[PDB]
Nucleic acid binder design. Structure first.
Length: 226
DNA sequence: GTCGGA
């Protein structure tokens, strides 16, 4: 849950969530073009304020002033809503990070083989996020985290954790400022997309290097050639 | 106040 692709146009993602009347996001036809989004970079993050959807470049990571380790990048759904650290973000800082799919590395001895994981039905993914409002300040230490859940079904062959992916409908409800943390916990349970909805394949080891951002990084490869 | 790898 530490790398993903966000490569298509804003409309390609937003059209599944809300029409223009609900948005406060300028039209922009350029593909985002990032096939290898990494922690510590700013990522276009979707949230609701002033009864409209906003898209802000937000630091992927969370390190308050009292935190001494590298920034956290994930928050476990099992505990985030009641965590002393994450409860306020669960209440007030919910957001959505849309993506084409995400990457996980499978341990194969002393080597690690990357896989790209995506929806079999060809929709983008809407990953549940929590973070530090106001997002538009562009903070470089207190940004957002991707909420995670336990891997299910065949994904356990790759890694024991996965992002919490919500249906489009659930993603829209998750962002609403009017709903409580308890209601958000219900949405996170009812809207989670199960592992049987995902497909995956090995990809090139080149995704390990964040200099690489091109479309080839999500193409299937033979492991024997790596 | 906790959770990826070139």
């Amino acid at each position: 849950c530490g790398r993903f692709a966000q490569s298509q146009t804003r409309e390609d993602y937003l059209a599944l969530l809300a029409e223009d009347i609900e948005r406060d996001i300028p039209y922009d036809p350029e593909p985002i073009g990032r096939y290898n989004v990494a922690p510590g970079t700013k990522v276009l993050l979707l949230s609701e304020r002033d009864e409209h959807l906003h898209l802000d470049p937000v630091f992927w990571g969370y390190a308050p002033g009292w935190w001494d380790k590298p920034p956290l990048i994930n928050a476990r759904v099992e505990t985030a809503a009641t965590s002393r650290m994450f409860k306020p973000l669960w209440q007030h800082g919910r957001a959505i990070c849309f993506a084409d799919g995400w990457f996980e590395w499978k341990k194969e001895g002393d080597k690690k083989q990357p896989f790209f994981i995506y929806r079999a039905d060809g929709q983008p993914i809407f990953m549940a996020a929590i973070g530090s409002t106001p997002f538009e300040r562009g903070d470089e230490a207190e940004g957002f985290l991707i909420v995670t859940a336990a891997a299910d079904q065949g994904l356990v062959d790759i890694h024991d954790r996965r992002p919490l992916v919500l249906s489009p409908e659930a993603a829209r409800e998750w962002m609403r400022q009017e709903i409580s943390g308890k209601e958000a916990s219900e949405i996170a349970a009812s809207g989670c997309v199960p592992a049987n909805q995902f497909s995956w394949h090995p990809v090139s080891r080149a995704v390990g290097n964040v200099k690489n951002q091109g479309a080839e990084l999500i193409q299937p490869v033979l492991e024997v050639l790596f």
